[PDB]
Amino acid sequence: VTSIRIDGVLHEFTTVPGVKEDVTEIILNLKSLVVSSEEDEPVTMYLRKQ
Amino acid sequence: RVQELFEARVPRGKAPIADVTGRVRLEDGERFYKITIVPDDGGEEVVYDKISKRQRLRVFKHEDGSERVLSDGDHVEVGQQLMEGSADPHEVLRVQGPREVQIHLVREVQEVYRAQGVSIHDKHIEVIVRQMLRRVTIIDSGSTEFLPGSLIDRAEFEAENRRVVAEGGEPAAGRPVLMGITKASLATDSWLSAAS
Amino acid sequence: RVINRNNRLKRLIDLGAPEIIVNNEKRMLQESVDALFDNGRRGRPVTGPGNRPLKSLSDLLKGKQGRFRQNLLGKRVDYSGRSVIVVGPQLKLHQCGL
Amino acid sequence: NNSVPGAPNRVSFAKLREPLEVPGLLDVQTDSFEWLIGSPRWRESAAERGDVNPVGGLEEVLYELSPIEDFSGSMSLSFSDPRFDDVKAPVDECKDKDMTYAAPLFVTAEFINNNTGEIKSQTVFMGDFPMMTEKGTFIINGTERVVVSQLVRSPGVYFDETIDKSTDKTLHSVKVIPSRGAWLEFDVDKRDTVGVRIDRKRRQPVTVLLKALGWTSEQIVERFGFSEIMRSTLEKDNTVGTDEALLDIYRKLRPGEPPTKESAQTLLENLFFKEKRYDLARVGRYKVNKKLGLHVGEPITSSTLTEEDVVATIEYLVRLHEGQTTMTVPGGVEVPVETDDIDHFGNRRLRTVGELIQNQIRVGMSRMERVVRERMTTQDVEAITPQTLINIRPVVAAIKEFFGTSQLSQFMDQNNPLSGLTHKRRLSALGPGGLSRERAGLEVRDVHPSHYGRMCPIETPEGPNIGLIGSLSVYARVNPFGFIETPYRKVVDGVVSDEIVYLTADEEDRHVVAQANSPIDADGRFVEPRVLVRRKAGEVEYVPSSEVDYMDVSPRQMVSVATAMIPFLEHDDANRALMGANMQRQAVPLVRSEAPLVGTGMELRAAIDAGDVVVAEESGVIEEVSADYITVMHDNGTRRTYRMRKFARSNHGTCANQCPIVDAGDRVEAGQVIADGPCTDDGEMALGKNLLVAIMPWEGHNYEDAIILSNRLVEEDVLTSIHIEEHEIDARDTKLGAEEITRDIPNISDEVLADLDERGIVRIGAEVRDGDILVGKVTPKGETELTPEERLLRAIFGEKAREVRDTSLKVPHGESGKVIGIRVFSREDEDELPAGVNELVRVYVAQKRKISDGDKLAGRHGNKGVIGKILPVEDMPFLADGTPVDIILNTHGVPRRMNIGQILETHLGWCAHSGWKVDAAKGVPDWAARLPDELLEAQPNAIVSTPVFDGAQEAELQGLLSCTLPNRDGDVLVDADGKAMLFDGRSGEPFPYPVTVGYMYIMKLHHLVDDKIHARSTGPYSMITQQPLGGKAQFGGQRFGEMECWAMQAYGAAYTLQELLTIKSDDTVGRVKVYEAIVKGENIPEPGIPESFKVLLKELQSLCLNVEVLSS
Amino acid sequence: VNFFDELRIGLATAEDIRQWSYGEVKKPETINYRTLKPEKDGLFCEKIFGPTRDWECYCGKYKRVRFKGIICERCGVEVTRAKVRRERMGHIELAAPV
Ligand SMILES: [Zn+2]
């Protein structure tokens, strides 16, 4: 992962209602994510959970 | 110790000095030591009334040993300290001249520095002591304008003395003398630095 | 103070008056000039605030802030820079890292 | 034995049990204020302590004042019973809204007129009071404040003794130091002239003043018959007669005044019996009574000196001169006779915040009552009302200025909770009302045998203020008078007593104190017949096991709070221990904290009492939790909510956050931590991380305290911190007009202001680079103006027809990061602002810093260092199983500094991390006899704790290192000694010899590199001195000391010095020309005349001194 | 330029001070407290020392940059950089020797 985009959030030093940990903690957790790329261009994923 | 030595104030130890060479005739006063030395050639005895709380130092003998006690009736060389301590530079200067006091100061500073173990060359101290003792106090002005008892450097004093003598005017009687760093630096030739 | 007193002298001498007032006024002028060239040299120094002696003209030269001393304490120069130092064993003797 | 409900479980190398839990670490700070204001809890505590008279602070101070009256006796005023009210607004809003946490106080004043006989009583408002929050801090104008205690010498009598160098005879000097009044010095001299020095006067014989009171000569003879020297003095004095004596005393005190009997008679009582003019604190009176054993059976009420005290003092002095050991006075029990010591804690009292605030309000009350009495005397006597009398300005102004400018009001450093706690517990010794640095003697900075148990001897600032700033002991508690105490259990007949009592310095000296570490049988029987003991002063000697009276409580009774959490403190050196303790107060809160693997058991307790961690009040069940707030349901049906501040700038620039560590649907018991603040992990302090260390010199990159770090730390955010800056701009009115923040700004490209919003401020969440504009504003131009006409003219016509300059605020030199939030205060919205201001706006910039080169690191044993180089993860040495190390330490610095404790800490950390299992099938090994039965079986990443002065011994470590659990690969890495075989990352071949490895706790200091680095080539120049500005923020050049001039002269370098002094500091045309020449290819022109010389000329020419140049 | 063979301090004289200065202060008034400008011949009047701004006449008659060495007759001031204000002096006249 290179860069994220959180809807309704303007930067990383803040929180979002409904979650138990702020943006920094989720960024740290996402750092552990492992993915393999087959295409040589920036691709985009989605993560929608309510 | 170094500050006091360079400042050339009254030594705290203030050891007795051998003003003249002669046959020491010392009578040990348990309260105040009384020291007299019979001159060899002739003259009177210089008398010292020193404090007896100390322990007499070595007498100058053929052996020249530190363990020896100050034996009465012996003989000592001019300028030698009779007891442990420090000799006032003015006394040794007046009774020996500038060379002896210069070498004594150099040796004393070198010794105190080597006590701590550090080592430095002598010339760095010679360059300082040369400036420190470069003044000639004058007792009388006579045929000179300057006020008697005013410090004058040796070069200018000699120049004025020779100039006045060459024209027949009587010479001015002056003697060398040293001072501390503060007094040696407060009197200079450039006015701007002095104001600084 | 000095200018004000001089103008009072001028006006008074113009108006005309006996010797006592003129002499007193001249004395006051001399006092002010002495104070300006130096405060506290002689007599009670002038004090306006908190009974604090004022810094006269001559005070610009003597003292720690005297202009003579301050020229020797150094100046702030350009083309400078400070940072921490870390030992580097990969450098020759006549070399340094920036 | 975990007192708190849900603290993490960490078995400890416990061998001895402490019979009492550590008292509230902040009770000392809060008790003073509680006593001062007066609350039911304080009254109950005082009644429990046994004090007969429960008296508050405000009531005492404003009751000792009343009843005021006029000299004519026809009018009087009284007012008592001070009471307080509720709060204005919560603490959060007060801190955020810039208000001040306070509360109003009302005093019921009664207005009585003597000649008439009327009473006018009603409540009166007396301003606000800066109440103290539950964390022992003062919130003033939104900025945290904390007042530090002070050390003062208790007012009393001190018997000094100086030996004459010539006479070689004892000269006993007694000097009395009351709170306010005259000083009496009775000294026996070689001449035997036993005299007095009242207000630094000549030594007048004591007998003269003794007779001045009318003391019969026969009573002098009989009461001093035992004294011989004083009898000789009596026979030697010439002047005799009550009238003659008093007149002579008056002349000595006040010469040149009408000598009359009435004058001296009134002056005596005025200077020694008028309470207002001559007063002593109740502590002083009690201490003097105890010293002389006089007036012991009654509670002190009158606080004035008495004649019997003086006669007893002189009797004591003469008896001491005679050489007696103990002296007795009728009505007084036997007491010893000896000289007093200044550096004894039986004399140096402690004035908490209560005393300081009481004195300040006393001064305010005196100022108010002076004007009140003058007004009542002068104002009409018929329709006068107390409301019109009392003036509230002086007291409020006094308290405000005390909180503002008093040196005892310091910003509470908030790098981490430990620093705040230490600051709250600090014991200052300097400041107003105390000795200065130069006058204070050097001896006071040394330890005293009476410091054991009261003030820690280790913790101390490194700077010149060494010995003047201590810290309370763990178990120290201030007595109601101000003398520090220390718990003790009294041995009655050689059997330890579980019940404990508190003893002060004087009582401690008068008894026998045992040693806590001395073995004691489970039944309370002393196994050893001979037990070491501490005696009167600096004396220790074995004594039979029966006469011993007192025993300490715990081995940790003399260490400070900061020093109490340094493992293996019994192995380091004093200087190293002090250095480590001071370093522990400089950590920086990280992003992901981890609790230490090895640390004392005083970590969680020091965190709960720190106040930076919330805790449930009542045992309830959590319904739901959120990242921003929590809601716990009480068992009584009352819902409560706690709000947790997230990413709020700390008082020192660091960040502070709170992350709840509770789950939804758990019945949380009362007293259980609910959220972890900065430097915390599961409700316990964590100031650093755990790194795998190696001890070996590596290619000189760790030379002379340097340090090497693996890139794994950098790329994993192991030591990444967050720092939040703060900037603010304001638009204040001016005579030429009022400035207004506006998006538009003259002559600026659209791109530059592309970030500002419509209102004229940068949008939140926009990256900012150094030199960028942060907020725009316009400054009007100056022209001719008229106050009465221009206002109306501007109102009717000529609106917005004047020039405006640009003075927008921009980011300083060397700052960057995101914009997290913007706070704007407007006078339109009825927001309190400083006078003469309309719009003050502050912007917070938060930057995430990753540990880099030039950063400080240091363990808990005081071993500083810098990051010499950060090698790639592929280059660091790695264990035989492929585990690369994270940091390498030099070895030559360990034995010279003599801090061997860190080696043991590393070994124990490795042992705990790897987990151990001591063999027990054949039985407990002899070396494992004293190990706790539950400490023989550990798990990977286990937690262990070694209390100071009582921890695992060398044999324990030797045994543990031989039973570590094997790696998952089946092999054990380290040997019994603790060393291991490595593999070089560069050469690829193993080192010829093994090396030591293990986990050691590493903190992060606040001396970062980004703050230090700075450059300056060309920039703004000062206008008054024509020199470049100074400081990194102002983008100014560096200073050039005179020693540099001396060095340049030494080398004989001339042109370089010329440039440094002329062409780069002062000469304007020189700077312009040289800059242009460098821009082009032309040679640098020779410098000119420095501005300093020309200024000196044009200034010296002002003193009529024609200073020519003589160019010829 | 930078050649200073010697430096001698001489005792000045009334005519010397007359020569040095470019004006004769007459009123003690400082900068105006309302318009923040010097008062006529006050302790800061531009007619004595120099223009408050650079290349700026008091009356604005010759405010353009291209005027050096030109004294404005309307206001009787000179046009040079603000620095010249730093290197010109004033002498007060005394009605009574001191
Ligand atoms: Zn003009």
Strand and helix map with partners:
The structure is cut from a larger assembly and holds one copy of chain A (50 residues), three copies of chain B and one copy of chain D (1112 residues).
Chain A: H1 23-31
Chain B: H1 2-7, E1 22-27, E2 32-39, E3 46-51, E4 75-76, H2 89-96, H3 98-115, H4 123-132, E5 135-138, E6 152-153, H5 154-166, E7 174-177, H6 181-186, H7 191-195
Antiparallel strand pairs in B: 1-2, 1-4, 2-3, 5-6, 5-7
Helix pairs in contact in B: 2-3, 3-4
Chain D: H1 27-37, H2 40-49, H3 57-65, E1 68-69, E2 75-84, H4 91-96, E3 103-113, E4 118-129, E5 138-140, E6 143-145, E7 149-153, E8 156-163, E9 170-177, E10 185-187, E11 195-196, E12 204-205, H5 206-212, H6 217-223, H7 229-236, H8 242-253, H9 261-272, H10 282-292, H11 307-322, E13 326-327, E14 335-336, E15 348-351, H12 353-378, H13 386-389, H14 393-405, H15 417-424, E16 426-428, E17 469-471, E18 486-490, E19 501-503, H16 505-509, E20 530-531, E21 543-544, E22 550-551, H17 574-584, H18 604-608, E23 620-625, E24 629-634, E25 639-643, E26 648-649, E27 655-656, E28 659-660, E29 667-668, E30 675-676, E31 689-695, E32 706-710, H19 711-715, E33 720-724, E34 727-734, E35 737-738, E36 773-775, E37 778-780, H20 787-796, E38 804-806, E39 809-810, E40 818-826, E41 837-850, E42 857-858, E43 866-871, E44 878-879, E45 887-889, H21 893-897, H22 901-914, H23 954-961, E46 979-980, E47 982-983, E48 995-1004, E49 1014-1016, H24 1042-1051, H25 1055-1063, H26 1068-1079, H27 1091-1100, E50 1105-1107
Parallel strand pairs in D: 7-16, 31-45, 32-43
Antiparallel strand pairs in D: 1-2, 2-3, 3-4, 5-6, 7-15, 8-9, 9-10, 11-12, 13-14, 16-17, 18-19, 18-22, 20-21, 23-24, 23-29, 24-25, 26-27, 28-30, 31-48, 32-45, 33-41, 34-35, 34-41, 36-39, 37-38, 40-41, 42-48, 44-47, 46-48
Bound molecules: zinc ion.
Family (chain C): Belongs to the RNA polymerase beta' chain family.
Organism (chain C): Mycobacterium tuberculosis (strain ATCC 25618 / H37Rv)
Function (chain C): DNA-dependent RNA polymerase catalyzes the transcription of DNA into RNA using the four ribonucleoside triphosphates as substrates.
